[PDB]
Amino acid sequence: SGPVPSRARVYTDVNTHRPREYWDYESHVVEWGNQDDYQLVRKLGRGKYSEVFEAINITNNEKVVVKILKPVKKKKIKREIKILENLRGGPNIITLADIVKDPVSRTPALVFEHVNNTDFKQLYQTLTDYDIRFYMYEILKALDYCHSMGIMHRDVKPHNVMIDHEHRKLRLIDWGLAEFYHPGQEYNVRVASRYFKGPELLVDYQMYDYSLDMWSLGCMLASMIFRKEPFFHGHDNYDQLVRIAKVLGTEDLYDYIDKYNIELDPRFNDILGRHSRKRWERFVHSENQHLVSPEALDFLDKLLRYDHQSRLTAREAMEHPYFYTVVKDQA
Numbered sequence: 001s002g003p004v005p006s007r008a009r010v011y012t013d014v015n016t017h018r019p020r021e022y023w024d025y026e027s028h029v030v031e032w033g034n035q036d037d038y039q040l041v042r043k044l045g046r047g048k049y050s051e052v053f054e055a056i057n058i059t060n061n062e063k064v065v066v067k068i069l070k071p072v073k074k075k076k077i078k079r080e081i082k083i084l085e086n087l088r089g090g091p092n093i094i095t096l097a098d099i100v101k102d103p104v105s106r107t108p109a110l111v112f113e114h115v116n117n118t119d120f121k122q123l124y125q126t127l128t129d130y131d132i133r134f135y136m137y138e139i140l141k142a143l144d145y146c147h148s149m150g151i152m153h154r155d156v157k158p159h160n161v162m163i164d165h166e167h168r169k170l171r172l173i174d175w176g177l178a179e180f181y182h183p184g185q186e187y188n189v190r191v192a193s194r195y196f197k198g199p200e201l202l203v204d205y206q207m208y209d210y211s212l213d214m215w216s217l218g219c220m221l222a223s224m225i226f227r228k229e230p231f232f233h234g235h236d237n238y239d240q241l242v243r244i245a246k247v248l249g250t251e252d253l254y255d256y257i258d259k260y261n262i263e264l265d266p267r268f269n270d271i272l273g274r275h276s277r278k279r280w281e282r283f284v285h286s287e288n289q290h291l292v293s294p295e296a297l298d299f300l301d302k303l304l305r306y307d308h309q310s311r312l313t314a315r316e317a318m319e320h321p322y323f324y325t326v327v328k329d330q331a
């Protein structure tokens with residue numbers, strides 16, 4: 001009767017110690033700027049719930065990015081906005097500069113700093129061992145910050161990392177699925193891209209936490225060092241867990257579901273089976289070898305765990321030997 005509760009190991013009570021206004025985003029009143037300050041230059045991209053454009057702020061002639069929202073519940077808009085305001089000035093977090101509405105179509109639009117983002121296809125082929133370490137460290141700065149500020153991103157994946165390679169500059173974007181961590185709270189598991197979903201989402205364990213982001217970071221790392229995009233290539237949410245089980249093995253999977261008393265979907269009985277835990281060498285080849293080191297594999301192994309309580313925290317990850325070269329060079 002019932003699954004076993006879980007609390008974050010770190011930053012557990014951080015929102016509790018804050019004024020209510022910090023996390024109680026439904027009570028946030030939105031401060032609207034002037035839509036006539038911005039002229040759209042060109043469309044940059046389309047999304048599930050948004051279209052993005054380059055624009056000009058005509059008052060200062062600064063380049064800017066405008067995310068025009070497709071219709072979504074005002075609660076979810078206030079969440080993204082609140083989270084972005086709370087995180088403003090944090091390391092490698094995209095800056096929200098303004099918020100406007102078309103006066104006619106009443107469609108809201110978020111205005112962001114511009115990053116001169118480099119071709120993601122072109123970039124993720126040209127990356128040295130050192131680059132991966134450097135940018136991974138940069139992402140962890142953002143994740144430790146937002147986690148320490150009581151926020152889970154819940155959509156960490158390469159499309160949500162903007163890199164200006166020229167200036168060695170990284171920004172974590174798209175805070176539209178982000179949520180405030182409160183101990184006890186049961187969250188929606190229908191979040192994140194399939195290939196980056198953590199086991200807790202896949203087995204429908206709802207009392208998850210910041211450590212979700214650390215799984216998805218692990219998925220990113222794996223694809224970058226092994227030059228295999230995506231690393232876990234499931235055909236759907238069920239086969240996604242199987243693709244994970246064929247690598248981390250089923251023994252730790254069933255220990256996980258046992259520890260938390262998770263009612264496993266019966267559909268899984270058929271497809272999951274029995275699989276051994278593989279070693280990482282099975283993914284090392286001559287093409288990717290220059291990216292792979294003992295340090296990288298040790299690090300990766302400690303992100304990619306079924307049990308969310310057992311994964312590295314962002315701060316622990318930043319202290320790992322994989323990053324010694326990077327930490328020395330920063331000071």
Ligand SMILES: COc1ccc(OC(C)C)cc1Nc1cncc(-c2ccc(C(=O)O)cc2)n1
Pocket residue numbers: 044045046047052065067094112113114115116117162173174175
């Ligand atoms: C050449 O620059 C681009 C080409 C395509 C593109 O596609 C988007 C749909 C990701 C974005 C950009 N550039 C930029 C530059 N600075 C910021 C952003 C940005 C994009 C999205 C978000 C968000 O979803 O919160 C926040 C910021 N985006």
